[PDB]
Amino acid sequence: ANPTTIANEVNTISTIGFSSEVVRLNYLKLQYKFRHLKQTSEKFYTSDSYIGD
Amino acid sequence: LFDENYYAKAVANIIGEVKDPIMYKWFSPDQIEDVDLQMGYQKTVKWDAFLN
């Protein structure tokens, strides 16, 4: 509220309030799967310029 | 070879006096890569990935 004038005698005064806020950050874990050639099978797919099918 | 081939020796000596081509200014150093082929064809493969 508006501040109080201090004149003569008074004990009822306007107040200053306080507050706290908690901010929360969420972290999420995600995954992907992909297919590939097995290590030991690469020699049977090696070509002149590349490796693969 | 140079003891027996004067033309080869002379080419080796005078090759330095030839100036660089002007095509080099049109490309960046990473955009030029030599291949080993005189005449014929050479295929290249580009691989891509996508999210499904």
Give the nearest chain A residue to B43 (CA atoms).
A49
Q: What does chain B come to in residues?
A: 52
Considering only CB atoms, which residues of chain B are within 8 Å of chain A? 42-45, 47, 49, 51
Q: Resolution of this entry in Å?
A: 2.7
A29 alpha-carbon distance from chain centroid: 11
Cα dihedral B22, B33, B18, B8, rounded to 10, equals -160
Q: Which of residues 10-49 of A touch B (CB under 8 A)?
A: 32, 34, 49
Q: Do A49 and B44 touch (CB under 8 A)?
A: yes
Dist CA A48 CA B41 (whole Å): 13
What the block records as the tokens of B34 is 């030599």
Q: Do A50 and B45 touch (CB under 8 A)?
A: yes
| A contacts of B42 (beta carbons < 8 Å) | 49
What the block records as the tokens of B46 is 């580009």
Method in brief: cryo-EM
- The three-state DSSP-derived secondary structure of chain B is CCCCCHHHHHHHHHHHHCCCCHHHHHCCHHHCCCCCCCCCCCCCCCCCCCCC
